[PDB]
Amino acid sequence: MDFRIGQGYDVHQLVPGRPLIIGGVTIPYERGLLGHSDADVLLHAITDALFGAAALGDIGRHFSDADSRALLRECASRVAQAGFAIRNVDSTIIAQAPKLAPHIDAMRANIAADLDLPLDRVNVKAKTNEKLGYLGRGEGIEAQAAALVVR
Amino acid sequence: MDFRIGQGYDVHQLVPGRPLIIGGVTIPYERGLLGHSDADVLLHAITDALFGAAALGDIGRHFSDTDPRFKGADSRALLRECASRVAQAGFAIRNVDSTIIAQAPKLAPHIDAMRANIAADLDLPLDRVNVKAKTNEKLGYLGRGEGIEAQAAALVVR
Amino acid sequence: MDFRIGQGYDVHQLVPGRPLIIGGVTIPYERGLLGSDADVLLHAITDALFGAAALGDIGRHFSDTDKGADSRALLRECASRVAQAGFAIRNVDSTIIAQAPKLAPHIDAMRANIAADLDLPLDRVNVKAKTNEKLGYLGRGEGIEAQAAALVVR
Numbered sequence A: 001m002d003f004r005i006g007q008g009y010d011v012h013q014l015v016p017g018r019p020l021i022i023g024g025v026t027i028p029y030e031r032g033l034l035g036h037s038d039a040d041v042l043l044h045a046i047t048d049a050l051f052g053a054a055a056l057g058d059i060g061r062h063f064s065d066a067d068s069r070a071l072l073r074e075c076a077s078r079v080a081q082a083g084f085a086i087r088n089v090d091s092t093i094i095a096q097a098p099k100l101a102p103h104i105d106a107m108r109a110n111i112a113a114d115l116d117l118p119l120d121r122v123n124v125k126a127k128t129n130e131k132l133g134y135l136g137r138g139e140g141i142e143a144q145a146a147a148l149v150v151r
Numbered sequence B: 001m002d003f004r005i006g007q008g009y010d011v012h013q014l015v016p017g018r019p020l021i022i023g024g025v026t027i028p029y030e031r032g033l034l035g036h037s038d039a040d041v042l043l044h045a046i047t048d049a050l051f052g053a054a055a056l057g058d059i060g061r062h063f064s065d066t067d068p069r070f071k072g073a074d075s076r077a078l079l080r081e082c083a084s085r086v087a088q089a090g091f092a093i094r095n096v097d098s099t100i101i102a103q104a105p106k107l108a109p110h111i112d113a114m115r116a117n118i119a120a121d122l123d124l125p126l127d128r129v130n131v132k133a134k135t136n137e138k139l140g141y142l143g144r145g146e147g148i149e150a151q152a153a154a155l156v157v158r
Numbered sequence C: 001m002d003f004r005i006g007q008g009y010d011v012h013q014l015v016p017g018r019p020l021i022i023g024g025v026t027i028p029y030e031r032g033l034l035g036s037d038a039d040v041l042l043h044a045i046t047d048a049l050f051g052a053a054a055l056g057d058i059g060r061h062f063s064d065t066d067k068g069a070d071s072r073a074l075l076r077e078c079a080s081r082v083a084q085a086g087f088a089i090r091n092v093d094s095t096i097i098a099q100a101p102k103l104a105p106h107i108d109a110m111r112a113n114i115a116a117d118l119d120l121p122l123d124r125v126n127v128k129a130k131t132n133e134k135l136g137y138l139g140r141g142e143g144i145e146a147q148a149a150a151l152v153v154r
Ligand SMILES: OCc1cn2ccsc2n1
Pocket: A010, A011, A012, A035, A037, A044, A059, A060, A063, A064, A065, B134, B135, B136, B137
């Protein structure tokens, strides 16, 4: 019936002395993402896609720059409050390193639990940047997301 | 229930001596976006998402940067023509979402006005239109303030 | 009804010595993409189809070991796995970002290839072309990016 689509984008720098947390998963690595929160680039992109589908603005407006899962849960709350139900989420992480493949199902599990969705409605994809640009040089990590909701 | 989705992308350089026009809003700034038309990166991205959802090709095709009739073209006029062609193809627009990526200036004070322009041009209520603002966290040409990028998504139904 | 959306991204470097193949179409150029055929557009569309189906990604379905298959063979196999998970493809839209060469003359051919491979009416497949306005590695002609979106229904 009243379907809406949303899209999200995020990028953070990789810096020494920070933990690397993506999709709620702490991944062993010598650098981590820099941000005012835990800098979970994946969760932020999904969050923006959800706000965007519900026409509620953006993550910058809702949570002025701690735990990104808490923010994702709050986002899901605001989406429900606006009268929408989430139908599915898809996403991509662009990181030259480290290897993300072993952690993906954990990420999906986290996101599914945070959005109160079954696993089959949550997806997370991994890509390198084929050594191009700042992502290619491992200076940051990007995430992209898409969300479908219904009123 | 014949739904279709589309996506769009655009980027333009930020240069001295040009109006900064994003989402139809003239924003006070010392630089502006360089292009053949008014170079409204956000409206272009949305226009491409709508043409894309309707499988009508793209804005480069409909409103060519090689055709002199679009020199300094009002991108809201282009967006309204896109919406007309989308309607004529048989599609109704259900919603639009978008992102602008810029180091500067601060876009937040202008976002609501952008949403209102897009809503007006697409004949949608405000609650079916969204615009989001992002920095690029200081990375790359966007982080260096060399250009501004926009992304869009649209849902339509035949 | 049970609609789902998916999105996809891909980028390959652009250097002398390889054919330029985008959307199944070989395009005369002084350079080409590095990868198989390195078909950036087919890869992104393949990723958006798997993501709409919540089946992971092209890296997981089609790794470097398992044959030699070109990117259209992968798109078709992608499409068959999507169907067995219960989903029908409703449409695909995409954008190729390349500073050069001119892609517009080749779009009809890419759409035809994609629609054939996905068994879709032509009017549910779209491909768009963008430059990067001379910004970044894309704008210096050091690589080509593709973006895709797909809608499916169970
Ligand atoms: O652009 C990086 C970024 C800023 N911000 C504010 C809330 S979540 C988030 N990610």
